[PDB]
Design a protein around this ligand. Structure first.
Ligand SMILES: [Cl-]
Ligand SMILES: [Cl-]
Lengths: 147, 145
């Protein structure tokens, strides 16, 4: 259920393609620059995500890199179901882009900045006492679901 | 035991370099093929790991890709401390699983992720048993408080 639901969208910066996976219930993110927006590279990214978190369902934009039997085969193999797409990334790709822009000049290559931004986003809280970061929220949700 | 303790080791296959990070207490793995065993690529891999899990300390082989200011600056920036350093049972397995699925993948990188998936989803001892994936989350969940 909610524990295994992720949204996958693409973002573009400096002629590069970035795939962003958001764990809906927590706001937690996994993002990476990929060589091209193809089924082969999208399948690779999804297989990487699935081996790190319990991915059960994904909501994508259902674009071209999903019509090929590549991504379909990967989702099949990993036990991932593809459902309804994203509406029309909302305040995520922009937010992630915001952090990236803020730290872009601190890294030589874009890939490093992307990861610095993912780190900042997932460790971000919302006040003292509790607050809870997206990183803590995802772990709590999955923990209190597998037990 | 080890809330944010990870071991980072390198492995080589088909003329390529793979970085393997093992969460000591759970056995959970994060591994990827990197373009070269350099400080710049090692720092990249560590930053990626650090943004996905609460990494506090890493045990590495303290080799050449750790003498450069690159990895030191990355650990510093992420708040990671480098300690003693080199499990072996989790690593060796990775190569075996990779060998069992290499044929299904066009590129090695894909086979590696397939292997990571299989390893982290592996059930402890059938029924009631726990996978490394479930163990790492349960460990960090109880640590948050
Ligand atoms: Cl996409
Ligand atoms: Cl290494």
């Amino acid at each position: 259920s909610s524990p295994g639901i992720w949204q996958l969208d693409c973002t573009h910066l400096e002629g590069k393609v970035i795939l962003v996976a958001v764990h809906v219930a927590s706001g937690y993110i996994e993002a990476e620059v990929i060589p091209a927006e193809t089924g082969q590279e999208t399948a690779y990214f999804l297989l990487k995500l699935a081996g790190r978190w319990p991915v059960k369902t994904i909501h994508t934009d259902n674009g071209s890199n999903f019509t090929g039997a590549t991504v379909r085969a990967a989702c099949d193999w990993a036990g991932i179901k593809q459902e309804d797409g994203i509406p029309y990334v909302e305040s995520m790709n922009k937010e992630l882009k915001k952090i990236i822009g803020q730290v872009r000049d601190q890294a030589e290559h874009l890939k490093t900045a992307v990861q610095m931004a993912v780190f900042i986003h997932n460790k971000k809280r919302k006040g003292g006492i509790g607050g809870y970061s997206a990183g803590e929220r995802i772990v709590d949700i999955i923990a209190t679901d597998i037990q």
